[PDB]
């Protein structure tokens, strides 16, 4: 309900980068005011990068007028052939049509419901803020950053707890993968005698120099 | 490239023969040893230094030598 305030356009664009073009109810959740239908409409009618918001060419105007006589009032058909969007095509044709002739019953009334707020440009962020336009932005920032889960936090803490318990047990005192070699595959015999090599390995295992983790 | 690292393997071969061994070293080791065959398997008589040479040689080589999303794009600007 209401036109798009520029913070919403940018949260929608960041979400389209994070989430893609088919997650409009995931994107709809960052924005509290807007529903997935409106997010989708805003993207396709104003924020599609492939929308030419540039000034109108005049090859384009004569295409638009050719089409508006070929497929009369079929702006959804006409629009991709011009290359613009149906609201751009529609009001551009209205402009050109008044250019020929050179209140109005044909304009928005104060307190009426605008049909396509998703076609109008974004109301820019204002000199102030609101806990709506700041709590939404902070929700957006977090939800745009987070990809983790929670039990990793347990992880390190749990290991530390266990380490502390081990230390306490040591103070009180104050398979087996070290008795056996796990599923040991001994190197196969070759042409060279490895008796001496085996002795050296045992000596190396016997060594106990201080080493940090 | 296997040709690049092949001339680098020959780098290492000629460098290490220039670095660890000498012609009279070689020829007197031979003069002690008439068989330079059918002796395969039995370890040959060579100075105990030789071993660490290899080791030191290769160890020489050694001292010459979000988060995951950044890597992805960093492959694409690389490519695109």
């Amino acid at each position: 309900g209401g036109v798009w305030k520029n913070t919403e356009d940018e949260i929608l664009k960041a979400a389209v980068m994070k989430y893609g073009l088919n997650q409009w109810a995931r994107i709809s959740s960052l924005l509290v005011r807007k529903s997935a239908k409106q997010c989708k409409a805003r993207w396709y009618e104003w924020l599609d990068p492939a929308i030419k918001k540039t000034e109108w060419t005049r090859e384009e105007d004569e295409k638009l007028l050719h089409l508006a006589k070929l497929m009369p009032c079929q702006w959804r058909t006409i629009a991709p052939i011009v290359g613009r969007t149906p609201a751009q095509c529609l009001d551009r044709y209205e402009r050109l049509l008044d250019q020929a002739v050179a209140d109005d019953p044909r304009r928005l009334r104060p307190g009426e419901i605008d049909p396509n707020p998703e076609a109008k440009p974004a109301r820019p962020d204002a000199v102030d803020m609101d806990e709506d336009e700041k709590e939404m932005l902070s929700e957006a920032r977090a939800r745009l950053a987070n990809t983790r889960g929670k039990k990793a936090k347990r992880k390190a803490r749990e290991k530390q707890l266990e380490e502390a318990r081990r230390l306490a047990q040591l103070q009180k005192k104050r398979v087996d993968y070290s008795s056996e070699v796990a599923f040991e595959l001994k190197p196969q015999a070759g042409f060279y005698s490895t008796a001496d090599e085996e002795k050296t390995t045992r000596s190396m295992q016997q060594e106990f120099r201080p080493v940090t983790v | 490239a296997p040709e690049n690292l092949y001339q680098a393997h020959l780098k290492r071969a000629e460098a290490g023969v220039a670095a660890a061994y000498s012609v009279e070293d070689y020829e007197r080791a031979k003069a002690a040893d008439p068989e330079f065959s059918l002796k395969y398997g039995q370890q040959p008589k060579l100075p105990a230094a030789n071993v660490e040479k290899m080791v030191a040689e290769l160890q020489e080589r050694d001292r010459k030598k979000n988060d995951r999303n950044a890597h992805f794009n960093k492959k694409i600007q690389r490519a695109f």
Binding site: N6, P124, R141, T147, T212 | -
Partner: peptide
Amino acid sequence: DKQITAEQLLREAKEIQLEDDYKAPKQIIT
């Protein structure tokens, strides 16, 4: 006075440094 472009906020998110994990404490080991 400054507005809200994306990228800068993305950089801020990068600063929010995610949860890259803190290194295990180097407790002295006997």
